[PDB]
């Protein structure tokens, strides 16, 4: 409705909750939703990660389970406001790869503009 940290949160939360919540194919999450939560640039990169994630080649596919809790998404409001709104985002992605567990926490900074994500960029602290 306007912009605020928590308004920004919800957009990021939905972005992540949508994209990192599927059963086997990340394609089923509805690419329209990301288009609403994020700009074309972040939309286009995302759909591309989705594509290669699901389909590496006709000779390679495997079960991938990804799921994330929206309020387990730690969004550290980054204050600077570089004309845009910088929000540091860190969220664990509960994955299972062909029955094998993988649980890691991705951290990316997300920039919010126009009630959307206008840019996201992966960051790293150390191991993650």
């Amino acid at each position: 409705s306007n912009t605020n940290q928590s308004e920004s949160e919800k957009i990021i939360k939905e972005f992540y909750k949508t994209v990192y919540n599927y059963e086997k194919s990340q394609k089923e999450i509805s690419m329209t939703t990301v288009k609403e939560l994020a700009t074309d640039n972040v939309y286009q990169e995302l759909q591309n990660e989705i594509n290669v994630n699901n389909s590496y080649s006709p000779q390679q596919n495997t079960i991938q389970k990804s799921s994330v809790n929206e309020n387990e998404i730690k969004i550290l409001a980054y204050e600077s406001k570089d004309n845009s709104q910088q929000y540091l985002v860190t969220a664990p992605i509960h994955q299972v790869f062909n029955g094998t567990k993988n649980d890691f926490e991705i951290n990316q900074l997300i920039q919010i503009k126009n009630q959307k994500i206008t840019q996201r960029t992966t960051i790293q602290l150390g191991e993650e």
Side-chain angles (χ1 to χ4, degrees):
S1 45
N2 194 271
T3 33
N4 173 266
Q5 294 90 332
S6 300
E7 280 287 277
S8 304
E9 284 182 69
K10 86 207 307 187
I11 302 158
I12 305 172
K13 294 181 177 173
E14 303 313 274
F15 183 87
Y16 281 61
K17 179 174 72 196
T18 300
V19 307
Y20 294 113
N21 273 277
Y22 57 94
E23 55 157 51
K24 320 306 189 304
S25 38
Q26 204 169 274
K27 289 160 176 293
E28 320 314 295
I29 61 174
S30 301
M31 295 180 181
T32 187
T33 306
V34 48
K35 144 219 300 177
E36 310 170 30
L37 307 179
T39 51
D40 184 82
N41 60 276
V42 280
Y43 162 90
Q44 71 183 214
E45 55 170 84
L46 181 90
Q47 61 179 151
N48 270 271
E49 76 175 76
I50 292 179
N51 196 35
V52 306
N53 169 270
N54 295 211
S55 309
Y56 302 92
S57 50
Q59 59 182 31
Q60 188 56 210
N61 178 268
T62 174
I63 300 297
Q64 292 174 32
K65 261 293 307 170
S66 303
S67 301
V68 53
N69 172 30
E70 45 171 271
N71 291 274
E72 188 52 72
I73 304 179
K74 289 76 68 179
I75 303 175
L76 182 282
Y78 224 96
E79 302 299 343
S80 181
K81 274 59 183 181
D82 328 86
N83 179 271
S84 309
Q85 305 161 90
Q86 183 184 150
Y87 292 94
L88 207 292
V89 183
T90 305
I93 310 297
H94 301 290
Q95 295 189 329
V96 193
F97 184 78
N98 210 328
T100 292
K101 214 70 190 53
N102 174 39
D103 292 86
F104 67 119
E105 196 161 273
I106 80 174
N107 45 93
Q108 316 186 213
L109 102 160
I110 270 63
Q111 189 174 91
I112 294 279
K113 181 79 60 161
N114 290 323
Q115 297 269 211
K116 309 172 74 67
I117 295 90
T118 182
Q119 182 59 32
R120 67 178 183 153
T121 311
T122 187
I123 58 159
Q124 194 176 330
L125 292 306
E127 185 171 78
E128 295 196 277

